[PDB]
Chains A and B, each alone.
Chain A
């Protein structure tokens, strides 16, 4: 009986710890997936804009090519 009493309080502690642990893990996982995603979104946006700048040079060069 004294053994099972010891086992029960130990199970209460492990389930509480596993809960805090899983929560910590889920949050770390989500804040990293979100950081990578938002960064990848700004990156994509600025390459599209940087290619609009690259194209404008191609236009200014095509104009000077006639002279």
Chain B
């Protein structure tokens, strides 16, 4: 445990993956060239978790950029920070995955996958002690969906002893109009259940509704949604990047958050919710907000379920007494929403460095049984098409069988049944 290898696949993966490096680069005082220009040495104490230090004391992100089309990666290379990334670490195709999981996993992705793994291997070599892997991707497309999950499976074969963690973007009919998305998403969940240690369920429905109802953006863009995603990614990784006691590594996080191996889908939360365009928040406000439904990055009502485990990260200069007071107040005021059979399931961290333009923030990470709502949604949409076998030719024309679909459908339905099991479980 020390170094994290980051992989970003497909359009969504590369867009959110790019925004991630831009945000934490500024946080750790690294300019678009890779040169350090910060005020604190707290910025470099754990820099090697995400960055490789190179000759002439220049910091290179330990990032692999994957896609089955050049498009997005070209705009990432043309972008502000595209210069920070190692150019040998840009692995792309020309075909595209055409929003088809079968193309990303079996046909087109199959052709590119070993070139990615050679870059994964090279990065893994330059590691004194590799922790595991981080992947950004959407579950609704073809590349990040199909290729991303095949890359996880292949990485797991070569590194079975390491931690596999993902930032998976869930589809919403409010953001996308690609009919096949529920199919790709169910095929991807089946993979995530088996092969990941931790998954941050980033839901496009919740990101859209936050932008519309709370940020009062009439016509939200992808960059608006990605702004909330980059804030969430910066917050959920804090403990890994800065000196600290709680969840300072991927494994310690998993042991605190995962009571049952399939139940590793986290509902991230964030306070204050902001749009890209003064008024500081009190420790009590940060606490009410981070636990509020309106601040969740997954379109689930936490009050409809029970928390199995919670991680709370507070960023900035505040009272550790008051943080502790408010955290205990939240648990003691709503004790029914926290399983009694997992004693002291809420663990809190406080980090002195806040994000850009915020005096203070709070990031929540919850393993709530209410995540079954997101899975019931994708399941409702999948079953509606699959019971009439609609749009399957796109998949069977790639060599897949109805069996894979029936299996994926079953595993996700079983996962929803498991989350219910522990919601109705008493001590």
Contact = CB atoms under 8 A, between A and B. Distances in A.
Interface stretch (A3-11, A22-30, A35-43): A3-11
Contacts of A15: 397, 399
Given A12-B106, A12-B107, A5 B150 contact: yes
B280 interface: no
Contacts of A12: 106-107, 397-399
A8 B106 contact: yes
A11 B399 contact: yes
A9 B153 contact: no
A15 B105 CA distance: 18
A13 B397 CA distance: 9
Interface string B371-401: 0000000000000000000000000011110
B42 interface: no
A10 B398 CA distance: 9
B399 A10 contact: yes
Interface in B266-316: none
Contact of A8 (B153, B157, B400): B400
Interface centre among B106, B110, B153 (most CB of A within 10 A): B106
Contacts of B106: 5, 8-9, 12
B398 A8 contact: yes
A4 to B, nearest CB: 9
A1 interface: yes
B374 to A, nearest CB: 26
A7 B105 CA distance: 13
B356 to A, nearest CB: 42
A22 to B, nearest CB: 15
Contact of B110 (A1, A9, A11): A9
A5 B105 contact: yes
